[PDB]
């Protein structure tokens, strides 16, 4: 067992006795997490295992995401919070000085998000439809990164709508698209690429195969 600092801030890698590497986050709240993810100690500090197959974000990092906008003190709007797995890790990366506003739709899942957001005082959970940013306009704040992972056919302009509401100028956006691999570059993803180019700037398009054999992420800068 060994814990090594990686390129991206507050994100680590975990060397194992069997040789395998699993992504690592600094556990912001010790003692808990309990049953599910594996807990590990190395030189005093407690760390949490970040599986790259459950998390689309963790997939993207292993998939070679060049620049990660989520770091220490980052404020994020997370559209598609779900059961809380993936945000708990951004909660860890963000640290206490940054904040995570999470918006999830189905009640069946939000109740789980609550438990996660209970112990972590940087996650602010919200039961709301992402199509109506007016509904949480009154609760949230202007953020630095827009993470959008909704089970909708029209995600692209649901995010855009949300962006001109809360996303800071010169900010960043991580979109999740149900995207297939050849030797062009982004001509394949022009439908969703050009739709943004009306008011956004494309940086990276990343196909999540084989970590997620369906989706792909588009990192974008807001003008």
């Amino acid at each position: 067992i060994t814990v090594k600092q990686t390129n991206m801030e507050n994100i680590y890698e975990c060397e194992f006795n069997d040789g395998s590497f699993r992504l690592c986050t600094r556990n912001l709240v010790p003692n808990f997490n309990v049953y599910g993810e594996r807990l590990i100690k190395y030189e005093g500090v407690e760390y949490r295992e970040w599986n790259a197959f459950r998390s689309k974000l963790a997939g993207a990092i292993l998939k070679g995401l060049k620049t990660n906008p989520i770091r220490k003190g980052t404020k994020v709007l997370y559209l598609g919070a779900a059961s809380g797995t993936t945000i708990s890790h951004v909660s860890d990366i963000i640290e206490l000085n940054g904040k995570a506003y999470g918006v999830e739709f189905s009640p069946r899942v939000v109740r789980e998000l609550l438990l996660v957001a209970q112990r972590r005082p940087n996650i602010f959970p919200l039961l709301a439809d992402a199509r109506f940013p007016q509904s949480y306009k009154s609760v949230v704040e202007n953020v630095d990164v827009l993470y959008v992972d909704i089970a909708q056919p029209d995600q692209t302009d649901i995010a855009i709508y949300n962006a001109k509401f809360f996303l800071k100028v010169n900010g960043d956006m991580l979109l999740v698209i149900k995207a297939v691999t050849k030797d062009p570059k982004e001509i394949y993803k022009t439908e969703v690429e050009k739709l943004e180019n009306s008011n956004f700037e494309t940086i990276q398009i990343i196909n999540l195969d084989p970590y997620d054999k369906d989706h792909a992420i588009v990192l974008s800068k807001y003008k």
Partner: protein
Amino acid sequence: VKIYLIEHVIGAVAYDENGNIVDYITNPRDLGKITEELLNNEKGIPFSATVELLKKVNPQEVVVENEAEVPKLQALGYRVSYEPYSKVSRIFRESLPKVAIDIKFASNEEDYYNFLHELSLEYTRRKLRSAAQKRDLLAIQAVRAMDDIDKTINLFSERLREWYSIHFPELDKLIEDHEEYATIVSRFGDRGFLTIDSLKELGFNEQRINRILDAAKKSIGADISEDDLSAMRMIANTILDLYNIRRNLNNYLEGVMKEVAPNVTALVGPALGARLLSIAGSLDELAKMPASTIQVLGAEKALFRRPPKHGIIFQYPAIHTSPRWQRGKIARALAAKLAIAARVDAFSGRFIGDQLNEQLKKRIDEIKEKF
């Protein structure tokens, strides 16, 4: 004189066309009020803070964030318009950590986000509060399981102690904590596998470390082999599992208790409120129980004329810390406010914990100051 109207958790803020604060009315730090007004803001009803703000400015034209409000504000006789993502509304949120202190909603950043946290949790439970019904019975099953786990731990730890005493009799009386005992059996096994640095990795002071290792060599117990160790470890690790499951169920309990009956929870706590529902049968059956019945939910003491008698409710820190003579007068006050809390959650109403705790605090202080 055109005013841009911002409605937020902190209150209502009037801006000019260039993002300068013209006037503000600050929301009070009450979770119950802000939550309810936020639900109204979705339908288009403005904050009472907005009505007050608009009264003390009476502008030429107002422009609101939300289009659902336009008619409701035109009903008061104001000229109302609607911009969605206005350059003003953004500027407000760009400086949101600061303006919260600037309008005197909070003293610093920490307690603002500590408020916003308590809120975000409450608000998103109110939209759940018109629930998928049966939730109270689940909490009952959750708190009963915790009692079933605690009762199990004692059974396994006793058996683990009696088993392990064969290899190490000195350890049984050295640590009365059942958890720590099982931890030593888990990672070590044989006595001669214990080091000075291995024991500090669990958080032990030097005065007990030198008692254990001195007893390790001076052990009267017989030599043991890896059959027994692997067998003892099975129970030892299960004890450690149950100790986690109990702490984890307690976290689940809080999430259900604050969702189904949040007003009862704010008074007594998650665990005590859960245990009250267990005796009643359901949430509705707690509301039908009057103030006098709640106070005596031990059932064994009244039927004579249980363990920790005059009310099961006395586990409350104000009846436990305070001396024996005040206990009668406090138990009534708690049960009276518990009665309200039950009925208000049975209707599935708002949050009144912030006033009920302050109402109980005033009366507890009025009992302590009467000698």
